[PDB]
């Protein structure tokens, strides 16, 4: 009697089912988390494809001005999108069976809500699934944490921000141009560039790419001669071999002479931990930034912070970026606002 | 020999390696970095942009910068001994000589650092992939900080070395060039996000397929020619999770070299394009359709409107030398706002 | 409201991260492979290949 | 929608000329591979 | 003229085939939208 109860239950039908579900012999692993994931992602995918190709225009801002997002309605790959649900609906659950017809549903942006909810569910289940297979194969279980960062980002832009703003119409559009729109408006109303968490995110992705290129170049540089000339050096490695394929000492030495001796890593485990940690933390912080700005704790405001002796404002770059922000603000959703302050 | 003695001394194993490349690198690196600190602490941008730009004036780290030269200077190299400053250091700083200083010394600094990578690689006896990978960042600096302004009117429209200033350069390129719509930039984004993805996923995978080479829960201490992690287990895992996995370590490490570097190069192509205002600004089909049909709307057209707003309002403040006067009746805007 | 809501989202979020971390490590420590893969008992090597 | 007609050509030609290229290489590659694996 | 000794065979594994197909088709997606304008 310790921690795990090591015991079985004798070739029962339900036990056979549990065995097949949790089987590590399946080409694609289908854990319990997969019992959630597969149907959700399939529904989401089907509705997404069909809508991206043939869905009628959607009244996104509830002002009876439908926006066209599908290919068969004059869009291309870059401009096509699944338009977010109507602002008249807000955060109300709008399933197909709550509409009078599929046509109404399409008009108010039901597809977006459906796809977003199903996708978030299925992706959470995807995270859980990564853990699950790690456990079934006797691995360490922290890949799903790493993947928890992107899940957090998706959850931020598809769920939390609509919650803070009171409408799924503020959720990120499922499309390229729509994404850009989301970004611009977000900058106008939260000044995300001046938010330290977004700066942390940029550090995460720039730094991530940097360390990717760095590690890659270092290991590629110190590959051990196992191949002939003009032949692919990749052939000099075989899957499953125990011998290391590159000179780690030579790489550490190079890096040591590039900057200084104590700037380099000696422990590969430490190095790869760092490689995993930097971008994941960055993205974590940016996701938090998107959600907390979803509750209007915006980026740093230095508008007219510098004054002269007489009391006149001396502009800085923050004032210029504020000018651009103003442009986006006054220009976005031209027919949606009736009152001078944009509080929603 | 004389040259041989020079080489021997320069290539000595010090705490900080020097080399011939060091002869080029260290002065220029030092001067660029120092010029940035000097400028962001003391020098203003009142006579170039009409902006406070230093700690001395009340800027913080986010709003302080070494701003671009005055538009009237054109593409002048702005030497201290140039016909513009004529030796006068004060007038030199007031003109914006620190920007060209930082840019040129930074450029030659980058050359020197790449040459350093090549030199150390050759001395140690490694393949020069670090330098190539670094050709990436160089392409970014050359295209954005040199080529783009050289294509434009003057250095004035080049990025200013500062946080909020860089932010300004960003929103400027959005509002004026529709830079997000440019496919080359999209490839760049693919490169960076893909790079961060690869970094994270490789790190996590190696960390979570580790072999038990110790008794402590601290697996760091337990680390040889033997692989410290199970490549086969990793392959199995990602094959059953994602459908496809790496099988060749060499190909893997090359791949996470290749993705981000390529990203950078592509986006650079884009930026050259913008240097000549050769933009990916519009989709003529949708503009014509929208012109004839007032009920047709996409996120593309919405972003076009956004660009127009950006351009007006900021146009008046961001380009003071133009003396742009936009009466409040001509400024584009929606209802109420 | 902004302070409270944002702060507690921050907290709830990182606390969830901690939940994933410690739950995973709890499973791995219970089963007995939280310190790495047994070089003499690698599960994959005892499995039929995927294809 | 008024689009540029040449696009059609561009796309298809673009897409199909490397595709064929790849396929050609691949199949002959495999052929040779087979031969060498057979006489071993 | 005589038999050339500089001749060499060319290889392309299935992984490179799939990566090539993926590259071409994805590039096509992107730029297709820009070519039609």
């Amino acid at each position: 009697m310790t921690v795990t109860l090591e015991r079985r239950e004798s070739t029962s039908l339900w036990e056979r089912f549990c065995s097949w579900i949790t089987s590590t012999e399946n080409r694609l692993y289908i854990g319990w988390f997969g019992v959630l994931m597969i149907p959700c992602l399939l529904t989401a995918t089907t509705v997404f494809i069909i809508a991206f190709i043939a869905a009628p225009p959607v009244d996104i801002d509830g002002i009876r001005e439908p926006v066209s997002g599908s290919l068969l309605y004059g869009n291309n790959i870059i401009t096509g999108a699944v338009v977010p649900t109507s602002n008249a609906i807000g955060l109300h659950l709008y399933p197909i069976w709550e509409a009078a017809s599929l046509d109404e549903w399409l008009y108010n942006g039901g597809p977006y809500q459906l796809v977003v909810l199903h996708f978030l569910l299925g992706v959470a289940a995807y995270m859980g699934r990564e853990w699950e297979l790690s456990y079934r194969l006797g691995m360490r279980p922290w890949i799903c944490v790493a993947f928890s960062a992107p899940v957090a980002a998706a959850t931020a832009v598809f769920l939390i921000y609509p919650i803070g703003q009171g409408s799924f119409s503020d959720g990120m559009p499922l499309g390229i141009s729509g994404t850009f729109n989301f970004m611009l408006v977000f900058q106008a109303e939260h000044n995300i560039l001046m938010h330290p968490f977004h700066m942390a995110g940029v550090a995460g992705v720039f730094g991530g790419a940097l360390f990717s290129a760095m590690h890659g170049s270092l290991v590629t540089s110190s590959l051990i001669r196992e191949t002939t000339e003009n032949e692919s050096p990749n052939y000099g490695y075989k899957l499953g071999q125990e011998e290391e394929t590159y000179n780690i000492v030579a790489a550490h030495g190079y890096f040591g002479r590039l900057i200084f001796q104590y700037a380099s890593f000696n422990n590969s485990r430490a190095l790869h931990f760092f490689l995993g940690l930097w971008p994941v933390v960055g993205i974590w912080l940016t996701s938090i930034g998107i959600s907390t700005m979803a509750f209007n704790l915006n980026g740093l405001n230095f508008n007219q912070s510098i004054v002269d002796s007489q009391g006149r404002v001396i502009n800085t770059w923050a004032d210029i970026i504020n000018r651009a922000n103003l442009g986006i603000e006054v220009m976005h959703e031209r027919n949606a606002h009736n009152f001078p302050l944009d509080l929603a | 020999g004389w040259f041989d003695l020079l080489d021997d001394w320069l290539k000595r194993d010090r705490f900080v390696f020097i080399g011939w490349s060091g002869i080029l690198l260290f002065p220029c690196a030092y001067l660029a970095l120092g010029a940035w600190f000097t400028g962001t602490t003391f020098v203003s941008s009142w006579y170039t942009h009409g902006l406070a730009s230093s700690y001395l004036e009340g800027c913080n780290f986010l709003t302080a910068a070494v701003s671009s030269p005055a538009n009237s200077m054109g593409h002048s190299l702005l030497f201290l001994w140039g016909p513009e400053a004529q030796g006068d250091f004060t007038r030199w700083c007031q003109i914006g000589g620190l920007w060209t200083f930082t840019a040129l010394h930074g450029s030659f600094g980058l050359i020197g650092f790449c040459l350093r990578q090549f030199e150390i690689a050759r001395l140690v006896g490694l393949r020069p992939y670090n330098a190539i990978a670094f050709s990436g960042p160089i392409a970014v600096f050359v295209s954005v900080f040199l080529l783009y302004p050289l294509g434009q009117a003057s250095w004035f429209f080049a990025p200013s070395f500062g946080v909020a200033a860089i932010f300004r350069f960003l929103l400027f390129l959005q509002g004026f060039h529709n830079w997000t719509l440019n496919p080359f930039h999209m490839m760049g984004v693919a490169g960076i996000l893909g790079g961060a993805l690869l970094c994270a996923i490789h790190g996590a995978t190696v960390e979570n397929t580790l072999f038990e080479d110790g008794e402590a829960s601290d697996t760091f201490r337990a680390f040889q020619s033997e692989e410290t992690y199970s490549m086969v287990t990793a392959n199995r895992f990602w094959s059953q999770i994602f459908g496809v996995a790496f099988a060749n370590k060499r190909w893997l490490h090359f791949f996470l070299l290749f993705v981000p570097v390529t990203g950078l190069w592509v986006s650079s192509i884009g930026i050259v394009g913008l240097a000549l205002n050769l933009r990916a600004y519009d989709f003529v089909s949708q503009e014509i359709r929208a012109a004839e049909d007032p009920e047709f709307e996409t996120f593309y057209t919405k972003n076009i409107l956004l660009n127009e707003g950006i351009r007006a309002w900021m146009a008046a403040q961001d380009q003071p030398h133009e003396n742009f006067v936009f009466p409040e009746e001509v400024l584009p805007r929606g209802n109420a706002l | 409201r902004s302070w409270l809501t944002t702060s507690h989202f921050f907290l709830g979020f990182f606390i969830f991260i901690g939940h994933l971390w410690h739950a995973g490590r709890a499973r791995a420590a219970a089963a007995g492979f939280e310190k790495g893969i047994n070089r003499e008992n690698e599960p994959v090597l005892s499995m039929r290949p995927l294809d | 929608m008024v689009v540029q007609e040449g696009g059609y050509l561009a796309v298809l030609l673009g897409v199909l000329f490397p595709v064929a290229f790849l396929i050609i290489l691949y199949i002959q590659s495999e052929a040779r591979n087979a031969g060498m694996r057979e006489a071993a | 003229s005589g038999i050339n000794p500089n001749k060499q065979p060319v290889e392309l594994n299935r992984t490179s085939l799939f990566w090539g197909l993926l590259l071409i088709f994805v590039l096509a997606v992107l730029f297709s939208s820009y070519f039609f304008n």
Binding site: I53 | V244 | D51 | - | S32
Partner: peptide, 30 residues
């Protein structure tokens, strides 16, 4: 009818992915 071309390219990519997954050449241990 550029929509035809877009659909074609997308279907092409998805097919390439499908065959990349279920018709890969199996990794073989040394």
């Amino acid at each position: 009818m550029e929509a035809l071309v877009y659909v074609f390219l997308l279907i092409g990519t998805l097919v390439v992915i499908f065959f990349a997954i279920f018709f890969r050449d199996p990794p073989r241990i040394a």
